[PDB]
Structures are given as structure tokens and as C-alpha cells.
Design a protein around this ligand. Structure first.
Ligand SMILES: N#Cc1ccc(COc2cccc(C3CCN(Cc4nc5ccc(C(=O)O)cc5n4C[C@@H]4CCO4)CC3)n2)c(F)c1
Length: 390
């Protein structure tokens, strides 16, 4: 098992709840001058009769609570009925030496750096490429409208991750103490957190459905008779941008109705997460079938012509390498490797490694379909000649 500050704070909440109930349920002692019973962030202490110490068990929410189940934090209140103050009139004296004491926090922090750098390169390249394809009016096709909508989905996905990471400053808090935990929990069960999470989910799903729109349009070019060019464009834009909403708002409704705490992370017993994960896998699988059929087409067209025994393979390899980025073919591997029953730190480590590799899909697409594209080079030359004549 892997544990981090995540699981420690999540157990702290349950400890606090039980402690609050006990404090609110414990009858007061019959005697007087008793030392008042309070919950400090570190531990919960009961009432103590004056002139004696308190023998409390080591709190179970600590990661090292199982190493020594024999320690006892000690706090003393004098015979007058007040806790013993320590030096410089500070928090009352307590004995913490009984039970006290690379990591998952470090791993997650490095993956975040690689994924942020990749998304930031992808964002910049896709903005340049959208400028280039929208600018020139000779490059106005239907396939270039599909490409612009795909670029838009990539850019929205990158922009959503930055907001989620910047709104909850987890990287700075990776070493927070007990006091800092209260705040962390307060933001998690707020409404800003839940709606920022919902926005990120929508942007992920919309990107996936624009790599299926790409695939379905190429397939219909290679296997179908020409049909109305507006009745197909409206249908494609509708599928790309508004089919995600048919399973992202039902998920956001069930989560909002049937949950009190948390920022809508994966529930404990029930599995609501299938409302999002299941259509994503459907799109990924259909787009894999499209990939295989298109490559079969290229192989027959390549065998029919006259080439060597090796030039066939060279051109086939180059074409397959150039088509993995457009249809997102690697997501079939990355969905095979991912464990769908992991929760907490393990889930975050797995997710971040996939994001670390797949953050640079937008950069690959931008280079392959806008910077080395032959027509784009052609307009750069033609535009340059008109200025050089002047
Ligand atoms: N309580 C609390 C708490 C505890 C510790 C710390 C600081 O230390 C640690 C330690 C381990 C991991 C982390 C961060 C690692 C991840 N981020 C934020 C975050 N990105 C997510 C992406 C996808 C999903 C998903 O399920 O698909 C869910 C995602 N989540 C967690 C929830 C979801 C909204 O936020 C949250 C923390 N930070 C703290 F900042 C808060």
C-alpha cells in the first residue's frame, strides 16, 4: 500500500468527527475544579481531575500509529485546575516524545512539472497553429474546420488543468502540519472545488469526442458517397461539443444530490464514475477500429502500385507513425495499463504518469498537421514572394 498526506488528512476528518461526538456526548464529572476536556489539532483529551496527568492513547490518524501502539501523549494540569503552561506563556505543556517520528509526495511533484511543461508547450504551439490556419483564406476546407475544432478541444483541456492546479495550491502544501489540514478540508468540500472539477471533466470528454470526430470523418471520406456538406458539418459539430453534455451533467447531478463531503472524487462503495469513464472507452475503441481499417486501405493501395520489398515497409512505417497522433491511438495501451479500482495516492500517481506522456499529443498534432504540411509551406512561400517584390 501507498500512503501520503492525502490519506492522513482523510483519516483526520473521521477522528475529528468521532472526537466531536464524544466531547458533545460525555457527561461532566460530578466533582469540581476539573480540568476542561478539549480537542487540540494533534489529539483529543478527556476531563482530568486536578493534580494528575492524562493517559491517552496515541492518535490512530497518524501514519505511524501502528508501529508503536503503546505510546501515550501526556498533558498535565496542576491541582488548581488548569493545564500546565510551558515557557514564554505558550500552548500548555505536553509530552509528545512517546510516539513520534523517495516518498509519494516527491514522485507526484516531479510528474506535475513534466505534465505542466508539456501542456504549456502544447498550448503555445496550438495557438500559433490556429492563427496560421484561420489566417490564410486559401486553406478553408471542411477537414480544416475539423482540425480547428480539434485544436480548440486540446487548448481547453490544457487550460482546465492549470485552473484546477492553481486554485488548489497542493504543491506548496505537500508538507502541511495538523493546523494546515483544517483549511485543506474546508476548500475540498466547497463549491468552487466541485465546479472546477466538473469543468475539467467536461474538457477531457470533449477532447476525446473530437479525436473520434476526426476518425469518423476520415472513414466516411474513404468509404461513402458524397452527402450534403452542411447537414454533415452541423451533425459533426453537434457530436463533438454536445454529446459530452449528455453524460457529464447526469453525473454532476447524481454527485451533487447523493454526496455531502468531498470534491467529487471516486466514491467509496458505489461506482458513479462509470457515467464518465464508460463513454470515453467507447469512443477510444471505435477510433481504434477506424485506425485499423484505414491502415488496411493504405496497405492495399501500396501493394497495388510497383515498389520494392522494403520501400513498402518504409512508407508504411512513416504513415502509421504520422496517424497515431490524429486518432489518439496510444489511449488503448494507456487504458489497458490503468487500474480502475485504485483510490487515493496510487490513483494519483498512475493518472499523473499517463498525463505526463499524453500532455505532448497537442504538440505532436500541431507540428504534423500545420507546420510541415505541404500546403502551409506553399502559402508561406507565396506570401513571402509578394512582399519581396514590393
Ligand atoms: N484533503 C486534502 C489534502 C491532502 C494533501 C494535500 C497536499 O499533499 C498531497 C498529497 C497527495 C496528493 C496531493 C494532490 C494530488 C491531486 N490534487 C488535486 C487532484 N487532482 C486530480 C485529478 C484527477 C482526479 C480524479 O479523481 O480523476 C482527482 C484529482 N485531485 C484530487 C481532488 C479532485 C479535486 O481535488 C490533490 C492533492 N497532495 C492537499 F493539497 C490536500
Amino acid at each position: 500500500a501507498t500512503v501520503s498526506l492525502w490519506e492522513t488528512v482523510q483519516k483526520w476528518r473521521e477522528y475529528r468527527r468521532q472526537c466531536q461526538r464524544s466531547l458533545t456526548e460525555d457527561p461532566p464529572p460530578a466533582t469540581d475544579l476539573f480540568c476542561n476536556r478539549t480537542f487540540d489539532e494533534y489529539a483529543c483529551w478527556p476531563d482530568g481531575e486536578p493534580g494528575s496527568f492524562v493517559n491517552v492513547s496515541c492518535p490512530w490518524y497518524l501514519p505511524w500509529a501502528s508501529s508503536v501502539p503503546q505510546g501515550h501523549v501526556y498533558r498535565f494540569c496542576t491541582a488548581e485546575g488548569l493545564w500546565l503552561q510551558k515557557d514564554n506563556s505558550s500552548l500548555p505543556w505536553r509530552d509528545l516524545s512517546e510516539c513520534e517520528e523517495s516518498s509519494p509526495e516527491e514522485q507526484l511533484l516531479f510528474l506535475y512539472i513534466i505534465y505542466t511543461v508539456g501542456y504549456a508547450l502544447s498550448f503555445s504551439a496550438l495557438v500559433i497553429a490556429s492563427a496560421i490556419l484561420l489566417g490564410f483564406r486559401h486553406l478553408h476546407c471542411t477537414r480544416n474546420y475539423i482540425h480547428l475544432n480539434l485544436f480548440a478541444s486540446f487548448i481547453l483541456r490544457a487550460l482546465s488543468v492549470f485552473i484546477k492546479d492553481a486554485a488548489l495550491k497542493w504543491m506548496y502544501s505537500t508538507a502541511a502540519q495538523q493546523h494546515q489540514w483544517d483549511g485543506l478540508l474546508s476548500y475540498q468540500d466547497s463549491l468552487s472545488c466541485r465546479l472546477v472539477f466538473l469543468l475539467m471533466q467536461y474538457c477531457v470528454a470533449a477532447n476525446y469526442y473530437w479525436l473520434l470526430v476526426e476518425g469518423v470523418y476520415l472513414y466516411t471520406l474513404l468509404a461513402f458517397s458524397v452527402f450534403s456538406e452542411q447537414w454533415i458539418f452541423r451533425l459533426y459539430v453537434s457530436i463533438g461539443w454536445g454529446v459530452p453534455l449528455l453524460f457529464v451533467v447526469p453525473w454532476g447531478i447524481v454527485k451533487y444530490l447523493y454526496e455531502d463531503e468531498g470534491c467529487w472524487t471516486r466514491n467509496s462503495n458505489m461506482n458513479y464514475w462509470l457515467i464518465i469513464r464508460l463513454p470515453i472507452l467507447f469512443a477510444i475503441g471505435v477510433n481504434f477500429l477506424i485506425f485499423v481499417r484505414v491502415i488496411c486501405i493504405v496497405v492495399s493501395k501500396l501493394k497495388a502500385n510497383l515498389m520494392c520489398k522494403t520501400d513498402i515497409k518504409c512508407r508504411l512505417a512513416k504513415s502509421t507513425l504520422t496517424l497515431i497522433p490524429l486518432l489518439g491511438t496510444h489511449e488503448v495501451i494507456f487504458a489497458f495499463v490503468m487500474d480502475e479500482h485504485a483510490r487515493g495516492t496510487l490513483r494519483f500517481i498512475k493518472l499523473f504518469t499517463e498525463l505526463s506522456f499524453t500532455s505532448f499529443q497537442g504538440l505532436m498534432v500541431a507540428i504534423l498537421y500545420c507546420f510541415v504540411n505541404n500546403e502551409v509551406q506553399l502559402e508561406f512561400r507565396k506570401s513571402w514572394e509578394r512582399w519581396r517584390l514590393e
